[PDB]
Amino acid sequence: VVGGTEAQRNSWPSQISLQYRSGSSWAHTCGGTLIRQNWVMTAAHCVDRELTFRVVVGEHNLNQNDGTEQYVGVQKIVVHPYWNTDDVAAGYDIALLRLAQSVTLNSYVQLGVLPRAGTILANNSPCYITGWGLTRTNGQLAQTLQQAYLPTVDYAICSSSSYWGSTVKNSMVCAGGDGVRSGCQGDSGGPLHCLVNGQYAVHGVTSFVSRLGCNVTRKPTVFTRVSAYISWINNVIASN
């Protein structure tokens, strides 16, 4: 997260760290969201390859053990069937992950609430992005959980020639773009929490930015639209 602040200790209860086996240790590679006791929402490009992964719930400080964490292994991976690694711009960047055991819910660990099928936000709606990614273009990874205010940019402005052009599709959502605040490497997979009638819900899954850099004016952060895939979600869960 470029241009934000440290989150309060366990204020975004359904956020997770997706880690991979490295030498003697485990290394952070993406974020994702807890949707059931044994299911998690993440991005297709995070799990495209042969690796051994685990997940951590109730985390804050990656470098230490505060007493709130639960470490669990990943047992099965299910990616969207249209996903094409060779083309992020086409959309479909989404995957589901079944856990080896169910976690215990409590005050530091809670499920993310999903939006009604087909919902679309108005221009300029109020939302926040969360994560352990770089705090500066070409900088380093954060040690604690960060957040930033990032309002939405509607489909009509986002797809315009001054913005993203045809790279953006109707199956995505845009937010940010003031050249000051945005997502940065290590933020892939994570949530975008937005307000509607006084309640929070998760409306995107972090996907991409520009090759020019992380926070750039006129190039908002791009996310997969969750509301366009609710029934696929339900099916997958039901039959596995």
Binding site: C46, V209, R211, V222
Partner: peptide, 30 residues
């Protein structure tokens, strides 16, 4: 933590996924 590189010629509306790539001697646009 490597990101994306651009040749002379590429358009500014090309995507870079939000994940680190393998360590390297990088030519950055930033």
């Amino acid at each position: 933590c490597t990101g994306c590189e651009m040749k002379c010629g590429p358009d500014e509306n090309t995507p870079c996924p939000l994940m680190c790539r393998r360590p390297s001697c990088e030519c950055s646009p930033g």
